[PDB]
From Swiss-Prot, chain A:
Reported function: Cytosolic enzyme that catalyzes the carboxylation of acetyl-CoA to malonyl-CoA, the first and rate-limiting step of de novo fatty acid biosynthesis. This is a 2 steps reaction starting with the ATP-dependent carboxylation of the biotin carried by the biotin carboxyl carrier (BCC) domain followed by the transfer of the carboxyl group from carboxylated biotin to acetyl-CoA.
Name assigned to this protein: Acetyl-CoA carboxylase 1
This protein's domain notes: Consists of an N-terminal biotin carboxylation/carboxylase (BC) domain that catalyzes the ATP-dependent transient carboxylation of the biotin covalently attached to the central biotinyl-binding/biotin carboxyl carrier (BCC) domain. The C-terminal carboxyl transferase (CT) domain catalyzes the transfer of the carboxyl group from carboxylated biotin to acetyl-CoA to produce malonyl-CoA.
Subunit structure: Monomer, homodimer, and homotetramer. Can form filamentous polymers. Interacts in its inactive phosphorylated form with the BRCT domains of BRCA1 which prevents ACACA dephosphorylation and inhibits lipid synthesis. Interacts with MID1IP1; interaction with MID1IP1 promotes oligomerization and increases its activity.
Post-translational modification remark: The biotin cofactor is covalently attached to the central biotinyl-binding domain and is required for the catalytic activity.
Disorder association: Acetyl-CoA carboxylase-alpha deficiency: An autosomal recessive inborn error of de novo fatty acid synthesis associated with severe brain damage, persistent myopathy and poor growth.
Protein location: Cytoplasm, Cytosol
Residues reported to bind CoA: 2
Residues where Phosphothreonine is found: 26
Tissue: Expressed in brain, placenta, skeletal muscle, renal, pancreatic and adipose tissues; expressed at low level in pulmonary tissue; not detected in the liver.
Name of the gene encoding the protein in the UniProt record: ACACA
Superkingdom of the source species: Eukaryota
From Swiss-Prot, chain B:
Related illness: Acetyl-CoA carboxylase-alpha deficiency: An autosomal recessive inborn error of de novo fatty acid synthesis associated with severe brain damage, persistent myopathy and poor growth.
Modification note: The biotin cofactor is covalently attached to the central biotinyl-binding domain and is required for the catalytic activity.
Full-sequence range covered: 735 to 807 of 2346
Gene: ACACA
Tissue distribution: Expressed in brain, placenta, skeletal muscle, renal, pancreatic and adipose tissues; expressed at low level in pulmonary tissue; not detected in the liver.
Sequence positions bearing N6-biotinyllysine: 52
Domain comment in the entry: Consists of an N-terminal biotin carboxylation/carboxylase (BC) domain that catalyzes the ATP-dependent transient carboxylation of the biotin covalently attached to the central biotinyl-binding/biotin carboxyl carrier (BCC) domain. The C-terminal carboxyl transferase (CT) domain catalyzes the transfer of the carboxyl group from carboxylated biotin to acetyl-CoA to produce malonyl-CoA.
Top-level taxonomic group: Eukaryota
Biological function: Cytosolic enzyme that catalyzes the carboxylation of acetyl-CoA to malonyl-CoA, the first and rate-limiting step of de novo fatty acid biosynthesis. This is a 2 steps reaction starting with the ATP-dependent carboxylation of the biotin carried by the biotin carboxyl carrier (BCC) domain followed by the transfer of the carboxyl group from carboxylated biotin to acetyl-CoA.
Binding partners and assembly: Monomer, homodimer, and homotetramer. Can form filamentous polymers. Interacts in its inactive phosphorylated form with the BRCT domains of BRCA1 which prevents ACACA dephosphorylation and inhibits lipid synthesis. Interacts with MID1IP1; interaction with MID1IP1 promotes oligomerization and increases its activity.
Biotinyl-binding domain location: 11-73
Name used for this protein in its record: Acetyl-CoA carboxylase 1
Subcellular location: Cytoplasm, Cytosol
């Protein structure tokens, strides 16, 4: 669950990053607007790394529970 | 204090911006006080671990602290 996959997760969760990513998907807005959107996306995705990192390790923790050990025997 | 021949010139070592800095490498575990809370000099504001041995962090100046790094870093 390295950074690349973390970003892929953020792509479908964070409303701000979603709004920016959808806006940048519009064809031929303007050069300046695309540059601004790209910088906003970079800043938002970088800013959200530690929180989604904690989420990731929580996700992995759900694999190490005794319920799984009981199901597997 | 720099002496050149028989003349003296004094240079200041910057410590002015009042930014709290980690004295060492390591990992941040948690912060002790609230983001935006007032701290007094000598009060511990953060808990970090290097060496697998925990070391706190005392504030130098009294003021209102805002954190840059998120807990776990």
């Amino acid at each position: 669950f390295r950074r690349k996959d973390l970003v892929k997760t953020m792509r479908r969760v964070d409303p701000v990053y979603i709004h920016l990513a959808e806006r940048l998907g519009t064809p031929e807005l303007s050069t300046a607007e695309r540059k601004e959107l790209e910088n906003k996306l970079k800043e938002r995705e970088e800013f959200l790394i530690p929180i989604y990192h904690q989420v990731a390790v929580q996700f992995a923790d759900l694999h190490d529970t005794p319920g799984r050990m009981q199901e597997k025997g | 204090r720099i002496t050149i021949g028989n003349k003296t010139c004094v240079f200041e070592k910057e410590n002015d911006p009042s930014v709290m800095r980690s004295p060492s490498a390591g990992k941040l575990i948690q912060y002790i006080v609230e983001d935006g809370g007032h701290v007094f000099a000598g009060q511990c504001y953060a808990e970090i671990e290097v060496m697998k041995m925990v070391m706190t962090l005392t504030a130098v100046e009294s003021g209102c602290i805002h954190y840059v790094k998120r807990p776990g870093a």
